[PDB]
Amino acid sequence: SMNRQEISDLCVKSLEGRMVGTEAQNIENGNAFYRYFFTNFPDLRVYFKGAEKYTADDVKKSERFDKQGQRILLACHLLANVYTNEEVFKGYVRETINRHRIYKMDPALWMAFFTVFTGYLESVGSLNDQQKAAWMALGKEFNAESQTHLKNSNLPHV
Amino acid sequence: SMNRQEISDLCVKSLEGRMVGTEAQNIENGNAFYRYFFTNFPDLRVYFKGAEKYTADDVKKSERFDKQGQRILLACHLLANVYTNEEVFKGYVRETINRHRIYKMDPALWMAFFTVFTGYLESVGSLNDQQKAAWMALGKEFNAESQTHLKNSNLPHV
Ligand code: HEM
Ligand code: HEM
């Protein structure tokens, strides 16, 4: 069924209630991702040097994660809104990968994120099998390129 | 006049001859921008540490601007592609301003950059008045949120 264009629409809709901004509610969506991420996937807190043991409250009243939650949420809207333009989509992912090499992540998490993120959108407002499948379509596309680039950069890949 | 969808389309089309990628051709599309930048706006070389006196040959033989070129070009691609979504656009502008805090730039250069970009586009190939005015409408929005963000961030602004 799913072509480049249809995936986008789907993904963008999922996020239309989780819009980025400068206001309290806009800052909440950002912060809330890490609250959920840290609660249910606490073993990945390692990469977050110093936040490696943060409880849901520590993140809630933090400014590091009000900055970092706003950055991740703005990244995820970016992926949804440019997916239609393949070469640029692949471009952005390569940049994501580069700015992540410093933490030297486990090269399977590039898939895992969308479990967390769909699991986060499924935790805040609403979702569906069509939307969640599009995110996974974007994920396969993300990881598809993410590995190609990891093996291209002489780096740990699967 | 002209609208968000109209701008998007014109701004994107003008960029198909300067696409991002891993091949030799794509990598120079970012590189040639700096070769242009430095050859026509030398007084702005001050920002690029170590590269304040660099030439076209210096930039060409540099693997630093190969990295750095793809980044600015990608950034401008994402700008053209997400323009239809205003909040995601505003978000990416605030983020761009954030990532430029360290250089403490002349706040007037946020408008000025697009003059340079269309300048580059015309040096490379085809760029019509509609394509040029579209970028100029896009820039007038980028800059608008630039100064707004810097204002409520306690940093200098025009
Ligand atoms: C699920 C696997 C991931 C892990 C373990 C991870 C981990 C991290 C960590 C530890 C940081 C730095 C936080 C700090 O020290 O303050 C970071 C930054 C960041 N991450 Fe991720 N991340 C993951 C997935 C992603 C994905 C898929 C995206 C793209 C949508 C992304 C986008 C970003 C952005 C935009 C930043 C900060 C700004 C930048 O470096 O450009 N992350 N990440
Ligand atoms: C004439 C105005 C501008 C100047 C003088 C300028 C200057 C710089 C400098 C000094 C760097 C550091 C890179 C290095 O040292 O190798 C940089 C990186 C970068 N610039 Fe700009 N910039 C300008 C406008 C813009 C605009 C409008 C954008 C938005 C598309 C942008 C996007 C970026 C990006 C994405 C990077 C890569 C590093 C990062 O993301 O933090 N720049 N720029």
Side-chain angles (χ1 to χ4, degrees):
Chain A
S1 167
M2 296 212 284
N3 58 316
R4 299 209 76 93
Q5 179 65 50
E6 195 220 13
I7 296 157
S8 281
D9 329 319
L10 282 174
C11 295
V12 180
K13 214 140 172 69
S14 342
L15 305 166
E16 69 183 1
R18 294 285 93 173
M19 195 47 70
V20 290
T22 73
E23 315 197 57
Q25 192 54 73
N26 293 300
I27 295 285
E28 183 58 5
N29 317 338
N31 186 262
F33 165 76
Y34 282 110
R35 303 219 298 267
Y36 170 92
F37 185 18
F38 275 39
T39 303
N40 294 67
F41 298 87
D43 293 42
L44 294 174
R45 284 182 299 177
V46 296
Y47 304 96
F48 294 78
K49 237 173 100 169
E52 287 145 313
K53 278 256 104 82
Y54 259 39
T55 141
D57 260 61
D58 299 4
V59 175
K60 180 181 267 179
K61 264 206 188 72
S62 175
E63 204 62 43
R64 176 194 186 166
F65 290 107
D66 276 33
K67 185 83 93 308
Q68 191 44 59
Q70 199 56 219
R71 286 203 193 199
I72 188 60
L73 186 68
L74 168 63
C76 295
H77 287 65
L78 273 202
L79 285 179
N81 284 239
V82 307
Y83 189 85
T84 50
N85 184 334
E86 185 177 11
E87 295 292 327
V88 169
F89 177 83
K90 284 162 82 169
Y92 179 78
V93 183
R94 285 190 302 278
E95 220 56 54
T96 300
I97 307 301
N98 286 357
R99 301 172 168 177
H100 275 78
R101 105 160 89 192
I102 168 87
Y103 327 117
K104 206 175 209 164
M105 276 162 48
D106 205 298
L109 298 169
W110 299 125
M111 264 316 299
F113 179 81
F114 309 98
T115 314
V116 188
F117 194 61
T118 61
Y120 163 66
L121 299 165
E122 212 170 65
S123 184
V124 304
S126 186
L127 218 75
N128 55 69
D129 281 40
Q130 208 142 133
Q131 281 162 353
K132 168 198 185 189
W135 277 121
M136 300 291 157
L138 193 145
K140 301 179 174 180
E141 279 246 36
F142 197 92
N143 186 91
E145 186 52 39
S146 300
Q147 302 296 326
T148 283
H149 176 79
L150 270 164
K151 163 135 272 185
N152 274 322
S153 290
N154 205 30
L155 277 159
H157 73 101
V158 290
Chain B
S1 290
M2 212 167 291
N3 68 268
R4 300 207 76 87
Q5 183 63 49
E6 309 174 44
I7 293 159
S8 166
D9 301 9
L10 288 154
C11 295
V12 168
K13 161 151 184 173
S14 55
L15 284 166
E16 69 164 25
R18 297 285 100 175
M19 191 46 58
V20 271
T22 74
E23 62 211 303
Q25 179 62 58
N26 297 296
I27 278 275
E28 100 90 31
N29 298 358
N31 189 258
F33 168 67
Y34 283 97
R35 302 206 317 270
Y36 172 80
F37 201 175
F38 285 20
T39 312
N40 304 82
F41 297 82
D43 56 4
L44 297 176
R45 260 123 52 80
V46 63
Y47 293 105
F48 301 84
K49 264 49 163 57
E52 290 100 325
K53 286 288 166 205
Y54 267 51
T55 70
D57 274 337
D58 293 352
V59 168
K60 175 153 271 177
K61 282 198 181 74
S62 171
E63 198 195 347
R64 177 204 170 184
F65 298 102
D66 295 339
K67 285 220 299 170
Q68 190 44 59
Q70 280 295 286
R71 285 158 182 160
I72 189 64
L73 192 47
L74 164 52
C76 295
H77 276 275
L78 298 162
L79 282 171
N81 276 292
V82 304
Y83 193 86
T84 48
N85 199 336
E86 196 182 327
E87 287 299 289
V88 168
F89 179 75
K90 283 216 263 257
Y92 193 73
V93 161
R94 296 183 307 273
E95 178 77 46
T96 289
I97 295 309
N98 291 352
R99 304 213 302 270
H100 280 76
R101 199 183 143 173
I102 72 168
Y103 316 104
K104 42 193 57 53
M105 294 160 48
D106 172 1
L109 301 177
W110 296 115
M111 188 53 157
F113 167 86
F114 300 99
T115 280
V116 190
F117 200 73
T118 62
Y120 169 58
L121 292 184
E122 300 189 63
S123 300
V124 269
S126 308
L127 196 80
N128 54 70
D129 313 343
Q130 271 209 318
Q131 286 182 326
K132 202 191 179 198
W135 277 115
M136 222 62 58
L138 177 144
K140 197 263 188 65
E141 283 212 350
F142 188 117
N143 182 98
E145 183 62 24
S146 280
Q147 319 308 335
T148 312
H149 179 50
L150 287 156
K151 184 190 169 163
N152 38 52
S153 286
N154 206 357
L155 283 102
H157 44 98
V158 181

